[PDB]
Amino acid sequence: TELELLRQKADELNLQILKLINERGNVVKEIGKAKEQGVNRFDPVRERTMLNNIIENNDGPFENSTIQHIFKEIFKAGLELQEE
Ligand SMILES: O=C(CCc1ccc(O)c(O)c1)O[C@@H]1C[C@@](O)(C(=O)O)C[C@@H](O)[C@@H]1O
């Protein structure tokens, strides 16, 4: 059915998104290794810079606040990975 074809396409997109989140995680781990800091590595200026750039590029069907929510979770995960 058409609905099953669309769900398959979304399923494959999920795995494409996962692969990029993982590649991004490896980059953020390397950033941790490079950056020699205080109690924690949180940098709100960096966060805001990334967020602004993502929103600048948001032509898609989601609201900017929704996109921000999702990327904040991605970032939070990156920081936690570094702090491992
Ligand atoms: O932006 C953040 C943290 C964002 C965050 C959002 C919600 C939270 O509840 C939280 O604990 C951290 O950190 C910068 C980006 C980074 O998380 C990334 O590129 O994945 C690396 C981190 O070292 C930066 O400070």
CA distance 67 to 84: 26
Largest Cα–Cα separation, the chain: 56
Query: With contact defined as beta carbons under 8 Å apart, do 35 and 41 qualify?
Result: yes
Query: With contact defined as beta carbons under 8 Å apart, do 24 and 74 qualify?
Result: yes
Indicate which technique resolved this structure.
Answer: X-ray
Tell me, in angstroms, the distance from the centre of ligand 1 to residue 79's CA. Answer: 5
Query: How many domains are there within the chain?
Result: 1
For residue 56, count other CB atoms closer than 10 A to its CB. 9
CATH number at residue 17: 1.20.59.10
Structure resolution in Å? 1.8
Best mutation site among 46, 50, 51, 54 for ligand 1 pocket (most ligand atoms within 8 Å of CB):
46
What range does the domain containing 70 cover?
A: 1-84
DSSP symbols for 21-43? HHHHHHHHHHHHHH----S----
Q: Tell me if 46 CB under 6 Å of ligand 1.
A: yes
The two counts, helices (H) then strands (E), for the chain are 3, 0
- Whose structure tokens read 């990029």? 20
